[PDB]
Amino acid sequence: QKVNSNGLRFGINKNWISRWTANSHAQTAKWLIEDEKIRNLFFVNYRNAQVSNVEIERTQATVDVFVYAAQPAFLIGSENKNIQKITKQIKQIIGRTTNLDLTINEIGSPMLSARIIARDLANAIEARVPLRTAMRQSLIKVLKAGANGIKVLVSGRLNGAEIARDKMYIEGNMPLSTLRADIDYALEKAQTTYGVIGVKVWINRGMIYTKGLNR
Amino acid sequence: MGNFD
């Protein structure tokens, strides 16, 4: 039960992270197998630069990438060591028959995405730190960031075989049935030393009023 | 409770 409201909140209310179209739907398998591999490259490898989203756009045997992070240094580095390596990886995952270009962008107020929130909470909990202090500092950080009401939930163990002692906090407004909230959702799987931990983050980022179409 | 002043 409690069907997730994130997936219901895409398409006519948010913007697709992957925009693409091609000819007759036979290579859709190929283009998909490609582009989610590029997408998961960042989510698997780089968990220290606080990358918010990666926009892949492909159209008529073309491809162009927008990457939005919080620390451009980790994706650039001294002597441009990072850009060449990521370019080599993308070349390895893209083939030698199509174009390849991208731009490095830094976006202000990067904390608006719950994905990096979940990543930071996973880093904190997997740092041999008591959960209480870490998540208290996390909620302090998300409230000082100017965001609206917040809600978090932790599952799995606390290195103890029980799920009857987990904690969720409710702050601010959380209307999910209200189709104007622009509420962001994220989740992360942190492998603790005793099992699997699922951390889920709901954040409210202001209600879009006087609007009837997506933008 | 004598007066305030």
């Binding site: - | 409770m1 007066n3 305030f4 002043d5």
Partner: protein, 240 residues
């Protein structure tokens, strides 16, 4: 004039032998007229005492609250009291929560002021249904908050027609040690009040007189023209 015999003309009559013993303390021996009655000598001496006390309290720019909740008479009376002089008042059943906790009601009053500014600004932003809902929540705010809508400092003195009628207000006043006056009866509580005025409240003829006396007590301190306690003549009052 001050505590002159002309003013005390009708202040007797109350519940039938329903008398709290702790107020034979300030009540005459048992009356023989099948109702509980009141005498007027302890009355006007205590009236002079409370008169001068609350007068010089209000000279120091004190914070004063008014309340009245009985069916219609005291409500219109306290409306008059509010209308001649700007002062905190209560017209309906106060739901409590100022002396025990005012910081919570601070949000309610602040939102009242913000929304009043909103109607002062808004012209046609809300449709007919939205406008009527807005005016209705304004009335909700008014009927319980519009008399205490101009203060952040808690009042230190208040009137009441009966402590038993407003035991909520009595208990809230008992949170602090602020003085309080009361139109007292033989069935009231003396130990939970600070200033006692044992007088008839079943008959409005005495209620109007006593409220006008306390009104003059709180009026001359504000330099506003007084009504009685200095007028040689008397004006007839009757409920209608």
């Amino acid at each position: 004039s001050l505590a002159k015999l002309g003013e005390m003309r009708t202040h007797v009559g109350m519940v039938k032998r329903y008398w709290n013993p702790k107020m034979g303390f300030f009540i005459e021996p048992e009356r023989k007229h099948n109702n509980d009655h009141f005498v007027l000598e302890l009355q006007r001496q205590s009236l002079q005492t409370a008169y001068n006390y609350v007068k010089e309290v209000a000279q120091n720019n004190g914070q004063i609250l008014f309340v009245g909740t009985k069916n219609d008479y005291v409500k219109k009376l306290v409306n008059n009291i509010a209308k001649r002089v700007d002062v905190a008042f209560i017209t309906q059943r106060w739901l409590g929560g100022t002396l025990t906790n005012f910081k919570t009601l601070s949000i309610s009053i602040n939102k009242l002021n913000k929304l009043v500014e909103k109607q002062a600004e808004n012209a046609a932003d809300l449709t007919k249904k939205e406008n009527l809902m807005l005016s209705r929540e304004i009335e909700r705010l008014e009927k319980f908050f519009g008399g205490v809508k101009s203060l952040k400092r808690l009042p230190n003195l208040l009137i009441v027609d009966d402590p038993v009628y407003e035991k909520n207000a009595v208990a809230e006043a008992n949170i602090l040690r602020i003085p309080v006056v009361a139109l007292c009866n033989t069935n009231t509580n003396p130990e939970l009040v600070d200033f006692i005025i044992p007088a008839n409240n079943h008959q409005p003829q005495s209620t109007c007189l006593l409220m006008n006396l306390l009104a003059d007590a709180v009026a001359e301190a504000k330099a506003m023209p007084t009504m009685f306690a200095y007028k040689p003549d008397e004006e007839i009052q009757i409920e209608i």
